[model samples]
Target: ACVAKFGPLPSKWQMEPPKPSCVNKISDWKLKILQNGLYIIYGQVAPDPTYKGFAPFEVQLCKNKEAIQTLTNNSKIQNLGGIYEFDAGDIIELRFNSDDQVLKNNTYWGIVLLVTPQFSS
Candidate 1:
């Protein structure tokens, strides 16, 4: 009996390793940029009150070489998304800003990147 889902197994069939999760801190960091494609950034923002309440932070994104469009914000597991283009070896930067008060554990942020490859033949 032949199985439909299984179809046919190839002698040299091999599965690629899963890609690592793109999650990271919203603070200053380096991002691995891809070539000839666009990427979308998604993340959440919330107020972390250690000594105070509703502390806000500014979010900034910058590309290393290519002048891709930039996006910024100041506020969830709930995520906001944006698109930008960069070279394969470009480094993207994520930075955050705060006020006089020191940032505490509660006042933290998170981000994840989604890369979409564009191909031309």
Candidate 2:
């Protein structure tokens, strides 16, 4: 059989995308203030390739189950993935504090961790 010029496509396309599941999660945080009155919050979630973005450990500040801000960044950091932002009362819940914000529905590489902080604390 001749190989396709481009990378071989899957025998069948993955229809109806799968949902990401939780894998591993680690975090370090405190309700203290920094020199600039910023809140220092740190978290690590290791979701395997199966998981699209950070795990359930990622922190988010919200209210009434609505999003306000995330703690992760849009850029990657040491072993971490991206940035997510959240406001204490604005967000209904908190999410991944990875190197960057978590992508809605997509698979990611190895255990992607995250680090996040709030300056407007």
Candidate 3:
């Protein structure tokens, strides 16, 4: 089992060390699953309270760089996530299109193992 939230830093997402044997820190902005299971991936993000946007932008929950789900809001915190199936070596990450600093330093995301069936190699 593994479940840990990703925090934010000045310029990018800050990831923590894996809490157990289920996953690995694959890159600066990615986590790789080492077990087969169903995962509950969640993310909650908002621009700074003092900042306003011209329009909504996308925050994507990406699986191997493909958008699994898209979520965003301009003024309110966008609560986002979904359950998905995964196999060993699957990569996961969160992404936003804009590089603008308005979206900095106030985001949370994680992947939790909900269930896994025993399998033989």
Candidate 4:
């Protein structure tokens, strides 16, 4: 399975749907996968680096309620990538700065198939 998506969802945070029909969501910020596999997951966001405020920018992906990875800290280009075993029907969330505009268009949160439980067995 492979999917990539960007844009907003009428909330504070955003989401990634590999495909429109392959995911279930409890809300705009919550997502559930439909494929079981070893997945390569990734995401990125670009916020203006010259802001005067002290907001820390981070590009993060999370499974359930916990943080999976926060790629960088207080950086202009927020990006991250990682590999993990994702099972069907597991909740996933793409997290970023409060400025949702940072991901308006040139952005992503994605999952691609690397392997499956059946494939490895």
> What TM-scores do the predictions have?
0.42, 0.20, 0.76, 0.65
Candidate 4 structure quality by residue, lDDT tens digits, 8-121: 323323324323444554554456867677777666666655545545565567787678776555455566678887777788876655554354454556556666677533
Worst 10 residues of 4 by lDDT: 9-18
Error of 1 at 77 (Å): 8.1
Runs in model 4 with CA error above 4 Å? 8-30, 50-55, 100-103, 119-121
- After aligning candidate 4 to the native by TM-score, how far in Å is the CA of 54 from where it should be? 6.4
Highest TM-score model number: 3
Q: Candidate 3, residues 73-108: lDDT per residue as tens digits?
A: 557778777888898888898777654523546676
TM-score of 2: 0.20
lDDT of each: 0.35, 0.28, 0.69, 0.59
Compared with the true structure, the alpha-carbon lDDT of candidate 1 equals: 0.35
lDDT for residue 103 in candidate 4, whole number 0-100: 43
Residue 119 in model 1: lDDT? 56
Give one digit per residue, the lDDT tens place, for model 1 in 37-75: 555544333323332434454444456643333223332
TM-score of 1: 0.42
RMSD (Å) per prediction:
12.9, 17.4, 3.6, 4.6
Any runs in candidate 3 off by more than 4 Å, and if so which? 10-19, 48-56, 119-121
